Write a protein that binds this ligand. Structure first.
Ligand code: C1B
Lengths: 94, 149, 254
């Protein structure tokens, strides 16, 4: 259980009734702090962090995109409208 | 593809894992968790494991009641969908951490501004003990007493 | 809309109202100055194909204020797979005669990319449905625009929670269910054709089209919406083709 240092990536173990509990560091999760949060940057995972569209690519980071009427920004994720009445925006709440 | 079954929530001091069956033969699983009226967040993307650590999410609001589901996809065609063009899944039981996690000054997997909270910082006056000691939360319906030392 | 509220004037700017000879027909959504998406079953009995108009900027059907814009519907395109009288492939793309002017009361709803819709919007829980249709199963249609926030369901759960029958259609992959089964909230007749809009990181997208249901707010039932994700390709395509010489047009689907 803990004697067998089961918690990876810097986690701490707590023994239990045979079991143990691993307290991970902010960037990992899993029973044994083994999954790395930082490696699931895919479009099925919270839209890749993109504001509007996401494209995953082979061996390379995913690219974020914007809808017609909007332009991608410096950050690479956010979109801004390049028009007056961009679709899906409510002018009286803008 | 076969749907997962026996989805269970194993939880102690808020470390919450969901487990299910079966062990997958040429299929993978992805899990989604939500609150009754929250959007669904996906986790353990296309794994072969039959467990998923959902601690990070449930400790955001330990007093919410979460529901989770597991999707099954053939491996390779992880875009497999069924007749109503959606992926095969199965739901878990609801889980209200604050009322169903098992207990064991202790730290819990609950975190506030980056640190961990303690059994009392989480249960305040709902936590009493026994003498050998047992921790009891009399304001519970299930898992009201911990184990002993 | 049974159980909704009044959509503040200007907050449902993509809402369209269709009328035949002055009489309320269905609802519809504005995707750009000359294109509107509605529900194919609304044209099953239109033998006055020119007396069909679409209104934008509309809010209160009793008074006229400075906001309404009206256009005739030049063409109505429905999937070649839609069978008149049925609920499957219940989508219609309407080409207006002249475009509308976008104003603070007339803005189009983003037609999302399919992948984005299936993978991200579909798991957003609540979306808004709107219209001037009946306020109770066989009650009075509304005068002011009504909007209702409904939660979406994956079909397994819909099938699992619905009281088995009526001579229902099936929930195909070209539909989806949203609503409540405790008979409190739902869309109703007169709302058909309008939108099911999802809010994602600041923009709104069209995820569904009010389509059918067992009554309106019937217990043990949810409302069924056309799943738009399955038609994006089709729409976009039609929106980039030559006008062809018909009022009703049946376009090949897929
Ligand atoms: N519960 C829900 N979420 C709904 C939502 C929208 C809706 N629209 C309807 C419509 C039902 C009908 C009935 C009649 C009834 O009163 O229930 C029918 O099929 O004859 C007709 C509808 C029609 C039908 C037509 C023409 N098509 C046709 N087949 O006759 C035009 C406009 C409509 O509103 C309709 O939208 N029902 C519902 C239920």
């Amino acid at each position: 259980q803990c004697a067998s240092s089961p918690c990876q990536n810097g986690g701490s173990c707590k023994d239990q009734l045979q079991s143990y509990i691993c307290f991970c560091l902010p960037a990992f999760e899993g029973r044994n702090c083994e999954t790395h949060k930082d490696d699931q940057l895919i479009c099925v995972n919270e839209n890749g962090g993109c504001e509007q569209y996401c494209s995953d690519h082979t061996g390379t980071k995913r690219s974020c995109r914007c809808h017609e009427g909007y332009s991608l920004l410096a950050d690479g994720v956010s979109c801004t409208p390049t028009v007056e009445y961009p679709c899906g925006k409510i002018p009286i709440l803008e | 593809t076969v749907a997962a079954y026996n989805l269970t929530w194993k939880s102690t001091n808020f470390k919450t894992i969901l487990e299910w069956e079966p062990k997958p033969v040429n299929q993978v699983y992805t899990v989604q968790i939500s609150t009754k009226s929250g959007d669904w967040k996906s986790k353990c993307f296309y794994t072969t494991d039959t467990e998923c650590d959902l601690t990070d999410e449930i400790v955001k609001d330990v007093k919410q009641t979460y529901l989770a589901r597991v999707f099954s996809y053939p491996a390779g065609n992880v875009e497999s969908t069924g007749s109503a063009g959606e992926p095969l899944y199965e739901n878990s039981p609801e889980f209200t951490p604050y009322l169903e996690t098992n207990l064991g000054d202790e730290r819990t997997l609950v975190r506030r501004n980056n640190t961990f909270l303690s059994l009392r910082d989480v249960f305040g006056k709902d936590l009493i003990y026994t003498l050998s000691v047992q921790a009891v939360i009399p304001s519970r319906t299930v898992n009201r007493k911990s184990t002993d030392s | 809309i049974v159980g909704g509220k009044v959509c503040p004037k200007g907050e449902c700017p993509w809402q369209v109202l269709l009328l035949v000879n002055g009489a309320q027909l269905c609802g519809g959504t504005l995707i750009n100055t000359i294109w509107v998406v509605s529900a194919a079953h609304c044209f099953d009995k239109i033998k006055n194909w020119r007396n069909l108009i679409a209104v934008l900027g509309e809010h209160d059907l009793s008074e006229h204020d400075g906001d309404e814009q009206s256009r005739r519907v030049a063409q109505v395109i429905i999937p070649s797979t839609y069978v008149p009288g049925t609920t499957n492939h219940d989508i219609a793309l309407l080409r207006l005669h002249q475009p509308v002017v976008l104003t603070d009361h007339v803005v189009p709803l983003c037609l999302p990319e399919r992948t984005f819709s299936e993978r991200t919007l579909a798991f957003v829980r609540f979306s808004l449905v709107s219209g001037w249709g009946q306020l109770l199963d066989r009650g009075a249609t509304a005068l002011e625009l009504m909007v209702l926030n409904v939660p979406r369901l994956m079909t397994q759960d819909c099938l699992q929670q619905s009281r088995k029958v009526g001579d229902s259609p099936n929930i195909t992959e070209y539909m989806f269910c949203a609503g409540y089964s405790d008979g409190s909230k739902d869309s109703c007749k007169g709302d058909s054709g309008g939108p099911h809009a999802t809010h994602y990181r600041g923009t709104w997208y069209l995820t569904g089209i009010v389509s059918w249901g067992q009554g309106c707010a019937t217990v043990g039932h949810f409302g069924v919406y056309t799943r738009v994700s399955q038609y994006i390709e089709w729409l976009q395509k039609l929106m980039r083709s030559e006008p062809r010489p018909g009022v009703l047009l049946r376009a090949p689907f897929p």
